[PDB]
Design a protein around this ligand. Structure first.
Ligand SMILES: O=C(O)[C@@H](O)[C@H](O)[C@H](O)COP(=O)(O)O
Ligand SMILES: O=C(O)[C@@H](O)[C@H](O)[C@H](O)COP(=O)(O)O
Lengths: 556, 556
């Protein structure tokens, strides 16, 4: 694999072998009262600041220099230029990778095969803006002349989680918007309990499918159409209540949606990078097209930061490189994303998909097997809740877990004269300080003595209350979670994932495990019909099917 | 530490080093027509069957036998008896561990400090049952004589996630119950956006706090009480709209809750094991006290299964030992929990707390540092959505991830004559089969040839479409997700976590990192008031605070 053969990588590994034991955060901060200034970026977007404080990481100036030299050696900048210039860097599928075109507010030409994509991007954005104005205003009416009160996105994966996470994050911007619902799971619970709360006369369905063939989405869409037509009877009424976000007009027409109700996107829009496209229509309906443009504008700002900033001060590049340090030298399997913001409750889940589906790969560009770690397991829940739960393992377990802590300075709900937000901020700050510092035997002993503990009881309990610390964090602090700032933060992590992929020499933009998934069930689905026991698979698959057939009509 | 000293553990590690190459699932199933029959448990609860199929694990007869011998050598059965007999096995805090007493439907005496706890357990259950009848029937009136339409649980961690996960899982059983809301985060978004949707005349607040001192919960409770008092303008009305779930009568009265409105629990009820106690009041209110009793009964059945079953066919013990095998021989950092059930969308999050807060430890019973791995990072999302996202990494990444796949045979919503649930079952089966089998270069070449790809397209795609497989899974299939079956499944994992803790010789039942977290914010809280620069901490803590002070009245 290219990475293990890279001389900057070998130099990094050799340094780690010799100097690893010098990396003690308490000692590094005590020796350098300017450590924060040396290891932090502040970005002024003109619509809020982003502080990326990476000073609580197990790095020194020499480590950061070697990491930046690795990014140069691995051709990060040349790879970046290929992406932005519309070259087919999705080399397995032979596609461009142009989510950056979707939010290209400058309208600088971006050529695929010598043809500018921006006229087509802007045509779909115009169509979305006109449709959002009509639905939100009440101009667009249901089949009995009522205004739309409820918008239901039907889609899965990349056609589901981005719009869900963004509408959750920007809920305060939704006044005067229809309610938004996300139906994704084939589990009939999902559509059933959603439809039970809706009126067909005032419900608009958005069938979100790049291919328009995904079994979960097409099955959910047929169930919603059956429910709708049971009320409306007239197949003509479907053109007022179903629209499609797709690449395929033929499949859309075959399903029964007027192709005029199709909002188009392109092969070079990956599902997990698609919320910036027509896939974002549920966002624009919920918070208005103006706020959707602000979301694209923030992503565009961070695209420019990524493109023009020297590597050593480049936010997504440095987040990527800290990740490489922890994955490929320390051997950490996981990365925790811990936003101190209830509106961002689906933010970690969104990057669980964006990161793991991108860089969960083992075959390099030359078709050779990697001989090193690739993408980590991404997980997390919002603070402060995690502090009462899994933070126990982060503080006192046997695993090293790099954590990203994120928080807005200004809250959308400054209740009780900002008392809640002050407590939230203090916890955000105090947790990363404790993870870094820990607590020595002597500090814990002196606190137990002050608490009034007996001499044995104290020496019993003492070692259990000792924290080794040295647990590294990034703190990412931003003025306020506005549509623009959310756009910038999402795009920052997209480019972090892109940089890690280039360094690992994998294709961040295909998903052959997900493409396989979509063909796995077809062999077993017909075998589940009838009482007859199944013998066509391995013993376990067969046993599980036969148990399902047995329990199918058990009464409990 | 005890485990690395244990001769059965050393024998297990010896075997791993030498026979690791035997462990090929494709080969194990081809050689053993009875592998499913030999490596699965079928449990008849008399209220549904549970099939625990562990046959797609990297184990043989010899491994399972050596694992059961380790459980005997580490004293699992003696530790189990100490828990159930009310001995103070929470040795750092000096407390019993008696969640099993909360659901002891047999009413067999359990003595703590020589007194039966069961009278007190059953007194609170009678009080809960009496209150739930009054609220749900409409007998219990708000301060303007209206029936309660909305119940708001206020609490964090163990006082939040259990009731939240259970009310989400048992949502079909809440017909005729009030709506339930969970406010947990200090983030003022959480209480603010909840209160905006409530009528104070018909809203009952539940203040859930073991200690009744937790800053998030007490701050949220005060905010709700202020909002309530602004509408009601009568301190007497508080007794109609606020109840407490706590161990601390003093602090409940001091807060202003009528001591008649207090539902008590005890020191030996761990927060992450508390949903079976008074903490479960919001469950009983939502789905009715009868369903809550069924939930306790299911747990009680699994408690008795755990207690009476020989180790080698004991469900929680075998799940625990498969975990030890992957954690302490294979070195897997993580455990994925993947329920194929939308109602279980918070089940992995619940055990993320339950597992990681229990076994995220590095200090043994003797007060010595472990020299081996302990608890894993637990994570997951419901199927089928994961198949479109992070399953890419499970199939083709560089990480080994033991996964538990869970599914009910019978759906709560058999829509389209069972078509959705048939697709869901087919996906659940096909995914674990594909993880085990993978797809060879030869098989992938044949599929591309058959698809009609040019030699150029074929040779470019071929190596990217290969799956090495050999990825182990548990399949846990149960008749139906009823209150009883949910209680059995939650208790099964509770006891898995207990067994792993005893084998590691750690205290599964303290949480000194969570207790530390509750003390951290108080030293930083005062520094945030006024706009003076802060210099009293490390450079990074100082840097972050100063940035917060700069941006907190920036206008964006
Ligand atoms: O990441 C992906 O590519 C997947 O999650 C897809 O977005 C998902 O399978 C849906 O595909 P489609 O939009 O073609 O229905
Ligand atoms: O696991 C724990 O102990 C915590 O998650 C607690 O449940 C949480 O801190 C709430 O404590 P209390 O119930 O004392 O408010």
């Amino acid at each position: 694999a290219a990475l293990t053969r890279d001389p900057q990588f070998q130099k990094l590994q050799q340094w780690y072998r010799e100097h690893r034991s010098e990396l003690n955060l308490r000692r590094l901060f005590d020796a350098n009262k300017d450590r924060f200034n040396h290891f932090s970026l502040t970005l002024n977007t003109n619509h809020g600041h982003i502080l990326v404080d990476y000073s609580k990481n197990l790095v020194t100036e020499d480590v950061m220099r070697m990491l930046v030299d690795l990014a140069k050696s691995r051709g990060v900048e040349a790879a970046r230029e290929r992406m932005f210039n519309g070259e087919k860097i999705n080399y397995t599928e032979g596609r461009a990778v142009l989510h950056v075109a979707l939010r290209n507010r400058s309208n600088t030409p971006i050529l695929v095969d010598g043809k500018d994509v921006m006229p087509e991007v802007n045509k779909v954005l115009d169509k979305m803006k006109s449709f959002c104005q009509r639905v939100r205003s009440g101009d667009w009416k249901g089949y009995t002349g009522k205004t739309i009160t409820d918008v239901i996105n039907i889609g899965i994966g990349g056609s589901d989680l981005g719009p869900l996470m963004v509408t959750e994050a920007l809920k305060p911007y939704s006044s005067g918007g229809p309610r938004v619902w996300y139906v994704s799971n084939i589990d009939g619970t999902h559509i059933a309990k959603t439809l039970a709360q809706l009126n067909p006369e005032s419900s608009l369905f958005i069938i979100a499918s790049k291919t328009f063939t995904t079994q979960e989405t097409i099955t959910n869409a047929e169930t919603a159409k059956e429910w709708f037509l049971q009320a409306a009877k007239d197949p003509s009424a479907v053109a007022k209540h179903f629209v499609a976000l797709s690449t395929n007009t033929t499949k859309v027409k075959e399903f029964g949606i007027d192709p005029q109700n199709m909002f188009e996107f392109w092969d070079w829009v990956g599902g997990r990078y698609s919320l910036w496209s027509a896939i974002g229509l549920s966002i624009a309906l919920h918070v208005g097209f103006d706020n959707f443009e602000q979301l694209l504008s923030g992503a565009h700002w961070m695209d420019q930061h990524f493109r023009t900033t020297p590597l050593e001060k480049n936010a997504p590049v440095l987040l990527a490189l800290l990740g490489i340090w922890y994955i490929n030298c320390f051997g950490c399997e996981t990365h925790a994303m811990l936003p101190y913001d209830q509106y961002l409750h689906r933010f970690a889940a969104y990057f669980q998909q964006g990161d793991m589906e991108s860089n969960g790969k083992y075959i390099t560009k030359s078709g050779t097997r990697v001989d090193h770690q690739t993408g980590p397991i991404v997980w997390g829940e919002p603070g402060t809740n995690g502090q009462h739960a899994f933070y126990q393992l982060i503080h006192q377990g046997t695993k090293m877990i790099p954590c990203d802590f994120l928080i807005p300075v200004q809250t959308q709900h400054p209740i009780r004269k900002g008392l809640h937000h002050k407590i939230l901020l203090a916890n955000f700050l105090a947790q990363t300080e404790a993870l870094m510092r820990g607590k020595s035997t002597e500090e814990a002993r002196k606190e137990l003595q002050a608490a009034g503990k007996s001499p044995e009881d104290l020496e019993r309990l003492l070692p259990h209350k000792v924290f080794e610390g040295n647990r590294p964090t990034n703190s990412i602090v931003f003025t306020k979670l506005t549509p623009f700032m959310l756009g910038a933060l999402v795009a920052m992590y997209e480019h972090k994932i892109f940089v890690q992929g280039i360094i690992w020499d994998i294709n961040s933009f295909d998903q052959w495990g997900v493409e396989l998934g979509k063909q796995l069930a077809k062999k077993i689905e017909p075998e589940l019909d009838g009482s007859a026991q199944v013998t066509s698979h391995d013993a376990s698959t067969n046993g599980l099917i036969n148990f399902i057939k047995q329990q199918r009509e058990a009464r409990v």
